[PDB]
Design a protein around this ligand. Structure first.
Ligand SMILES: [Zn+2]
Ligand SMILES: [Zn+2]
Lengths: 76, 185
């Protein structure tokens, strides 16, 4: 299956996943594909902020489901 | 009238920045700057006829010290932006006592914004020095260096040129326009 990750910049990221991937796995894939480190990523689906240790299947995320990516901000 | 390009040859759309946003941001976070604490915000707005307009300066839930700041509730920020159809166009923060430059942390943060939006800008205010700056990473080379970097430090240094101020003139065009500050704190 494919899922989509929608940003707040008008960009949609397409990902190749399987139902049993954890959220951690998904953020690693985003790093691989897009160059964003996992620690800066917050993923949201159906109004909830997703947890690293749970799986796509745990949140009912299926074929063509859309997650949302919001970045942390760290300044110094 | 302006056609901007990255170092890599990619065209950049104009970002219209309200002439007053820098001062307004300084005004709104004064109680923090006064207590020697940094503050950050998000530059939010809209795309109209192939140009971006910053319309809302969003101050998210955050924590800070004299030389750091960071968000603490990005879900709320997302909810707000999604409800109001507001794009992320960049960010801003204070160096209350320091010079105006991009720190290691700043570059790591910024890179992700700029990968998501090639026009994304980072505005740095240094109010003790009465200076400020609008910065972006070199694209592609500076973005590459930050993407491939994996060092804890987190003031750790980087090899080569990584970032630059936006050109004058360039893709960021200041204008005498309205602004709304949204304080989520
Ligand atoms: Zn900084
Ligand atoms: Zn680094």
């Amino acid at each position: 299956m494919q899922i989509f990750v929608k940003t707040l910049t008008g960009k949609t990221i397409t990902l190749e996943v399987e139902p049993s991937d954890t959220i951690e796995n998904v953020k690693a894939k985003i790093q691989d594909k897009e160059g964003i480190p996992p620690d800066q990523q917050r993923l949201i689906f159906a109004g909830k902020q997703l947890e690293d240790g749970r799986t796509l299947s745990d949140y009912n995320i299926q074929k063509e489901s859309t997650l949302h990516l919001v970045l942390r901000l760290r300044g110094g | 009238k302006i056609h901007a390009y990255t170092e890599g040859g990619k065209p950049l759309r104009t970002i219209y920045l309200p002439k007053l946003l820098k001062k307004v941001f300084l005004d709104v976070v004064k109680p923090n700057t006064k207590k020697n604490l940094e503050t950050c915000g998000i530059l939010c707005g809209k795309l109209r006829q192939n140009a971006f307009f910053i319309t809302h300066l969003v101050i998210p839930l955050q924590e800070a010290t004299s030389d750091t700041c960071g968000t603490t509730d990005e879900a709320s920020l997302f909810e707000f932006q999604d409800k109001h159809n507001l794009l992320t166009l960049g960010w801003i923060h204070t160096h209350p006592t320091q010079t105006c430059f991009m720190s290691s942390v700043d570059l790591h943060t910024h890179c992700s914004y700029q990968l998501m939006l090639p026009e994304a800008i980072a505005i740095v205010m240094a109010p003790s020095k009465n200076t400020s700056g609008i910065f972006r990473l070199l694209d592609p080379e500076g973005l590459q260096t930050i993407v491939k970097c994996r060092k804890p430090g987190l003031a750790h240094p980087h090899e080569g040129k990584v970032y630059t101020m936006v050109a004058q003139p360039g893709h960021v065009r200041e204008i005498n326009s309205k602004l709304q500050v949204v304080d989520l704190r």
